[PDB]
Amino acid sequence: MATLLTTDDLRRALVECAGETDGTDLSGDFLDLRFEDIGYDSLALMETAARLESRYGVSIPDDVAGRVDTPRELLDLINGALAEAA
């Protein structure tokens, strides 16, 4: 019953920005350089993390999130704030 955030969740948020595509070739893992692939420096995932921060009910991380290079870090970021919150 205790389910705050999962890997599959962060993935859905990363695709929401894309739009539509039934491609992707993940035959292992996708949390190594997901942000450093198309060009997700910060501005791209900035607005996305903003609206998602409200619907999720998480704080407003502009430092770590603003300069988030790792993908798995993003999940542990919002999910982390939710942990202490609960």
- 62-70 CB contacts, 8 Å cutoff, 24+ apart: 66/42, 67/42, 68/35, 68/42, 69/35, 69/36, 70/31, 70/35
What is the residue range of 66's domain?
A: 1-86
Question: Residue 49's domain is classified under what CATH number?
Answer: 1.10.1200.10
Q: How many domains does the chain have?
A: 1
